[PDB]
Ligand binder design. Structure first.
Ligand SMILES: O=C(NCCCCCCCCNC(=O)c1cccc(O)c1O)c1cccc(O)c1O
Ligand SMILES: [Fe+3]
Length: 290
């Protein structure tokens, strides 16, 4: 079933808000927001809300968000510094799926809004997250224009896609490989941009289905989209070395130089959950397959 969305009613100087984790009273125009979703951080920047941001997970701050490098840190996306959050005295904390498990602890500190994406309904959830944040600040007009521009980009990207080619999405960690299909955390490649999948039913898991290079060759993708989690975790291994092997070399993707190394900060950290990231990621795909 679809994830429950964020819903809100206007309460004068505040909103009454419900999402899939719970209910909150959120002040209008919140002044001190701790943001633990990197995509939503980029939406705050797109909406010119940088001064509302009181703290960010500096351990995982992407290259494309370095304008937030002066903000107080609240740790990393997987290493949340609850003391730092408390010390910032936020009026609102914004989380996604990585921090759901700490919901009760965060809500003790301040109202806690969940903005995770629904992998089965990416665009609907994406719009709900953007427009909910925009509603808090009265920025619906600006947000809607930016969403309309993204939808136009989606159409332009779709128009260049080759109906007869198929792709596989993989993730590398350590010297290991895992795979992702349609309606996964990386599913927009298939679900929104219409690139065909080599396998419609790849076993779901947060960090993917363990596979070997024999599987890659068996599926013989035209494109391989690679997300190197090693870069995010600080491990020394790299995808370019893992995939330089005799099995992968026999794929159409290798033979046509269509092993595409996706920017892991966008794909794995932001997850396309921002006005900036999603636009940039659509272009990244388009330019890789045109
Ligand atoms: O809830 C999540 N992960 C919890 C994992 C807890 C146990 C393993 C922790 C050590 C391994 N993970 C990392 O060291 C890591 C570091 C930065 C960002 C990540 O996403 C990471 O998994 C999670 C949710 C959505 C997307 C993700 O991807 C996640 O993980
Ligand atoms: Fe993770």
């Amino acid at each position: 079933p679809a994830m429950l969305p964020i819903s809100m009613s206007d309460e004068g100087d505040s909103f009454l808000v419900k999402d899939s984790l719970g209910e909150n009273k959120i002040p209008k125009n919140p002044s001190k927001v701790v943001i633990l979703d990197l995509g939503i951080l980029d939406t705050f920047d797109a909406l010119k809300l940088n001064d509302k941001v009181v703290g960010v997970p500096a351990k995982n701050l992407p290259k494309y968000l370095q304008q937030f490098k002066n903000k107080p840190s609240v740790g990393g996306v997987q290493q949340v510094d609850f003391e730092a959050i408390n010390a910032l005295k936020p009026d609102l904390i914004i989380i996604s799926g990585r921090q759901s498990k700490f919901y009760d602890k965060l809500k003790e500190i301040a109202p806690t809004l969940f903005v995770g994406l629904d992998n089965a309904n990416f665009l609907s959830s994406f719009e709900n997250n953007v427009l909910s944040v925009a509603k808090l600040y009265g920025l619906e007009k600006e947000a809607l224009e930016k969403i309309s521009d993204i939808k136009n980009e989606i159409e332009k990207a779709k128009s260049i896609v080759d109906e007869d080619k198929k792709a596989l999405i993989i993730l590398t960690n350590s010297n290991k490989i895992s795979a992702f299909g349609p309606q996964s955390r990386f599913g927009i490649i298939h679900d929104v941009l219409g690139i065909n999948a080599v396998d419609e039913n790849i076993k779901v898991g947060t960090h993917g289905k363990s596979i070997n290079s024999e599987f890659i060759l068996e599926k013989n993708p035209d494109y391989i989209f690679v997300v190197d989690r090693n870069v995010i975790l600080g491990n020394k291994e790299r995808a370019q070395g893992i995939l330089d092997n005799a099995l992968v070399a026999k794929t159409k993707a290798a033979q046509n130089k269509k092993i595409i190394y996706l920017d892991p900060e966008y794909w794995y950290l932001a997850s396309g959950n921002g006005l900036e990231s999603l636009k940039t990621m659509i272009l990244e795909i388009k330019n890789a397959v045109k």
